[PDB]
Amino acid sequence: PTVFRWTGGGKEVYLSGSFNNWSKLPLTRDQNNFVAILDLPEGEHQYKFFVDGQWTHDPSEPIVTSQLGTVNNIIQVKKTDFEVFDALMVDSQKAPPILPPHLLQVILNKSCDPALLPEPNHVMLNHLYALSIKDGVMVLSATHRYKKKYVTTLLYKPI
Amino acid sequence: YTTFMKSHRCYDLIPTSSKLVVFDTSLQVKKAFFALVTNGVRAAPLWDSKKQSFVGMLTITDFINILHRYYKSALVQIYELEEHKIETWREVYLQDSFKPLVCISPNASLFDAVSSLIRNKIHRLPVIDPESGNTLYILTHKRILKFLKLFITSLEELQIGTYANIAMVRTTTPVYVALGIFVQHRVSALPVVDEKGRVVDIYSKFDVINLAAEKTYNNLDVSVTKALQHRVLKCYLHETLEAIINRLVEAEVHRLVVVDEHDVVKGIVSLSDILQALV
Amino acid sequence: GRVKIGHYILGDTLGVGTFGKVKVGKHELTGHKVAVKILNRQKIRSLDVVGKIRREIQNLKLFRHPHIIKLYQVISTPSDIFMVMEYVSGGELFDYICKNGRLDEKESRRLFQQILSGVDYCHRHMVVHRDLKPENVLLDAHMNAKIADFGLSNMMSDGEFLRTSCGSPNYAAPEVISGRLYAGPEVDIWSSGVILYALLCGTLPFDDDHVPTLFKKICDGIFYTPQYLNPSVISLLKHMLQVDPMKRATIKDIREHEWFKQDLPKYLFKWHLGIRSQSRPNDIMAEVCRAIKQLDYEWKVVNPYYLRVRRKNPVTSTFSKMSLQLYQVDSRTYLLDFRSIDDSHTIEFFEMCANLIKILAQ
Ligand SMILES: N#Cc1c(O)c2c(-c3ccc(-c4ccccc4O)cc3)c(Cl)sc2[nH]c1=O
Numbered sequence: 062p063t064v065f066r067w068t069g070g071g072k073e074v075y076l077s078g079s080f081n082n083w084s085k086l087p088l089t090r091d092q093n094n095f096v097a098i099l100d101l102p103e104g105e106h107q108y109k110f111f112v113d114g115q116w117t118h119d120p121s122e123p124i125v126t127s128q129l130g131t132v133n134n135i136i137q138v139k140k141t142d143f144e145v146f147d148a149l150m151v152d153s154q155k156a157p158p159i160l161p162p163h164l165l166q167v168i169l170n171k172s173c174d175p176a177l178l179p180e181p182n183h184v185m186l187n188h189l190y191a192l193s194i195k196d197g198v199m200v201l202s203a204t205h206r207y208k209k210k211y212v213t214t215l216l217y218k219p220i
Numbered sequence: 221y222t223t224f225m226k227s228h229r230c231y232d233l234i235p236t237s238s239k240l241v242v243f244d245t246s247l248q249v250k251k252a253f254f255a256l257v258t259n260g261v262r263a264a265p266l267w268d269s270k271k272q273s274f275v276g277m278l279t280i281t282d283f284i285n286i287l288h289r290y291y292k293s294a295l296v297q298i299y300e301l302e303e304h305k306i307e308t309w310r311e312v313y314l315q316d317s318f319k320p321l322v323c324i325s326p327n328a329s330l331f332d333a334v335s336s337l338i339r340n341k342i343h344r345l346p347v348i349d350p351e352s353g354n355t356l357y358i359l360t361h362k363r364i365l366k367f368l369k370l371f372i373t374s375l376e377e378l379q380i381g382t383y384a385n386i387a388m389v390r391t392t393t394p395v396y397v398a399l400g401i402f403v404q405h406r407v408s409a410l411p412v413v414d415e416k417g418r419v420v421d422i423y424s425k426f427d428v429i430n431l432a433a434e435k436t437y438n439n440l441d442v443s444v445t446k447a448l449q450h451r452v453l454k455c456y457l458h459e460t461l462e463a464i465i466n467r468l469v470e471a472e473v474h475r476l477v478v479v480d481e482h483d484v485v486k487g488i489v490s491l492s493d494i495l496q497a498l499v
Numbered sequence: 500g501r502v503k504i505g506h507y508i509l510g511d512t513l514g515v516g517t518f519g520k521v522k523v524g525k526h527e528l529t530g531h532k533v534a535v536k537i538l539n540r541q542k543i544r545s546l547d548v549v550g551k552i553r554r555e556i557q558n559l560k561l562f563r564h565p566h567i568i569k570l571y572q573v574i575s576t577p578s579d580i581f582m583v584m585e586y587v588s589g590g591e592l593f594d595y596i597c598k599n600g601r602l603d604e605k606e607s608r609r610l611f612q613q614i615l616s617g618v619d620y621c622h623r624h625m626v627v628h629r630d631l632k633p634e635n636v637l638l639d640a641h642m643n644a645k646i647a648d649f650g651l652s653n654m655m656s657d658g659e660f661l662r663t664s665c666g667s668p669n670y671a672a673p674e675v676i677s678g679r680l681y682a683g684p685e686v687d688i689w690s691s692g693v694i695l696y697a698l699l700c701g702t703l704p705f706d707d708d709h710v711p712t713l714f715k716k717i718c719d720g721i722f723y724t725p726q727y728l729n730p731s732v733i734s735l736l737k738h739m740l741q742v743d744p745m746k747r748a749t750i751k752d753i754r755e756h757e758w759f760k761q762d763l764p765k766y767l768f769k770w771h772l773g774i775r776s777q778s779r780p781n782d783i784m785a786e787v788c789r790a791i792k793q794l795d796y797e798w799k800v801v802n803p804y805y806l807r808v809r810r811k812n813p814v815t816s817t818f819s820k821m822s823l824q825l826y827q828v829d830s831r832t833y834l835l836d837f838r839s840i841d842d843s844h845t846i847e848f849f850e851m852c853a854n855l856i857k858i859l860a861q
Pocket residue numbers: 064066089090091094096098502509510511512520522537538539542579
């Protein structure tokens with residue numbers, strides 16, 4: 062289906078085109094929006110408007126001038142125009158922030174298993190945390206998720 | 221039973237939120253064992269920065285080995301351990317006798333892991349995702365079995381484990397001596413016996429971290445009883461395998477002592493044995 | 500002479516809302532009524548919201564919850580995109596609370612359970628619907644809540660905060676009115692809190708014609724609790740309307756609350772972060788860059804305080820990415836943060852960070 066919309070005023074607005082043997086199909090008014098939606102065989106179609114006793118084209122829309130001086134609008138209905146994700150894809154063509162308190166909520170500091178840990182907030186995953194370099198060795202740490210499970214890795218690395 | 225193991229993936233056994241300690245082979249070895257203790261972990265993977273991959277696993281066995289290999293007396297420092305990197309020891313311990321890294325994938329089956337544990341004769345194995353290359357979790361027999369006990373809804377007749385010429389220590393046996401037994405015999409626990417063949421206690425590889433924890437490792441002359449002062453479990457041959465499997469888990473220990481009427485040793489039954497029988 | 504899309508005859512415009520007119524649709528043969536959001540392709544590209552619509556569709560298409568408006572189908576045309584959805588006769592909950600007054604304890608609780616259920620389902624799907632108000636809470640014939648404007652919504656990504664200060668100022672959270680970074684769900688709780696206040700009192704907790712006083716009130720989290728309010732619900736409102744997001748109720752804290760729990764149906768439900776340098780922000784960015792390139796790392800300066808950096812591995816011969824971001828901790832101190840970007844990955848990330856630290860301030 063293709064949307065044909067006239068944006069202006071008028072008492073009676075019609076849509077004439079190749080796809081209807083140039084018969085005056087009427088457009089229904091909402092506000093300053095006159096519409097009729099209809100399916101067109103994906104290809105080339107020429108149309109024109111009969112806005113209140115005057116034959117016009119939509120100047121904003123693409124035109125075609127004839128060997129006979131006929132000035133009509135043109136519509137190249139594409140296959141990509143009908144598939145939503147295809148259409149959307151074709152269409153897509155200071156001071157520092159304050160530290161969110163969330164990044165201070167850890168799981169290592171906060172009877173039971175020392176290997177086990179509390180579940181983390183998505184927001185603090187993949188962030189690097191580290192213990193002070195004590196005795197020329199660095200302790201680095203980060204919580205990451207593999208599938209529906211989490212792993213907090215500590216690296217004892219000298220420097 | 222084995223059918224269950226061939227279907228279930230390793231991932232299913234990984235806990236929701238775990239801790240993992242990785243040591244760079246460039247780290248001094250004493251700092252490593254101290255970090256095992258401080259983090260509350262029995263085994264940590266080793267990363268070779270130059271090789272850009274995990275080369276192995278540091279365990280309590282490595283501690284038992286450095287200790288025994290390099291102990292002179294309670295009067296001298298174990299200089300070697302004090303100043304030796306994980307790489308410098310791994311090359312000494314495994315000279316011409318070279319060994320790589322045994323590891324499982326999370327998408328690999330539970331069977332494949334149990335088989336690998338026995339195949340390579342190891343008690344702790346790492347799980348590495350092939351995509352990331354990240355170590356996720358370390359598979360311990362106790363865990364594999366605990367999951368099997370949750371799924372389940374005599375000892376003389378079956379005969380599972382080593383029952384003859386068992387490695388044992390006495391009340392007054394020095395820690396060093398015992399460490400040497402853990403080396404030559406390649407076993408995990410040594411039952412402590414009294415004047416008579418009757419068993420009083422059991423000194424395990426795990427009781428050897430207490431030396432590192434309390435920094436009491438420079439004296440290995442101490443009797444095995446003195447060492448165990450920082451703190452039994454028995455089974456018979458008339459007792460059913462399911463009752464024994466239940467007794468092990470409801471105590472979360474690695475093995476049971478096969479004992480006689482008047483507390484006398486007769487054999488042993490480990491988690492490694494039970495998991496071979498059910499494979 | 501009827502305008503049709505699907506076999507629905509497009510009728511009266513229901514509202515405009517976030518990204519375009521919503522009209523009624525009555526099926527030619529069945530008389531089944533739908534709500535149709537119209538997105539003009541050329542208009543949606545004028546605001547660069549094409550990415551937003553793409554995501555919004557992707558989400559709402561696989562959602563199926565009894566208190567969130569269902570997205571039946573998306574009909575694309577060369578000119579405009581039509582989002583067909585379930586139609587609810589009762590309209591705005593806002594207009595309901597206007598016409599009839601405040602709801603009795605029992606009826607408010609029923610509706611608050613339904614709304615919160617939906618809000619939860621969203622968050623369980625990593626979706627935070629910012630802009631949660633009774634004007635976006637529609638009612639059906641049987642008086643069921645239906646959450647409906649996902650225009651201002653956003654995804655919750657592992658390791659990231661949101662910034663957009665979206666939604667009405669009365670329903671907006673303090674951190675939002677303050678234009679500060681947020682996780683996402685906490686801002687939906689603060690919004691659900693004011694909805695609960697509106698359901699019980701018939702008025703807004705934070706409202707004044709003077710905007711600066713309205714804004715002080717939101718940040719001072721101070722609101723009036725009339726005498727008719729049950730102290731147990733006052734207790735719940737106090738917990739949801741916390742100015743400290745860290746001190747604010749989580750859907751769990753709410754499910755566990757004695758007032759919420761009542762007559763509830765079954766069908767619903769020492770480490771340091773990075774390194775902290777005290778230099779001037781721009782000096783820190785020069786200091787980090789004169790270190791990143793000193794390490795031969797490829798990068799891209801996004802914000803003046805956000806840097807996406809890459810490293811070519813000399814061994815695995817595989818590129819590893821990480822992003823750096825500088826925040827402000829104090830009136831005096833600032834801290835550089837290190838986040839891991841997915842393409843050992845984790846260990847290679849630690850090594851990357853470490854090198855930078857051995858040549859940097861606190
Ligand atoms: N604003 C705006 C706007 C629109 O309104 C539309 C319509 C539209 C649909 C139906 C009617 C209609 C006509 C008569 C009576 C009842 C009716 O609902 C009017 C217009 C399209 Cl189609 S694409 C489009 N794009 C826009 O940007």
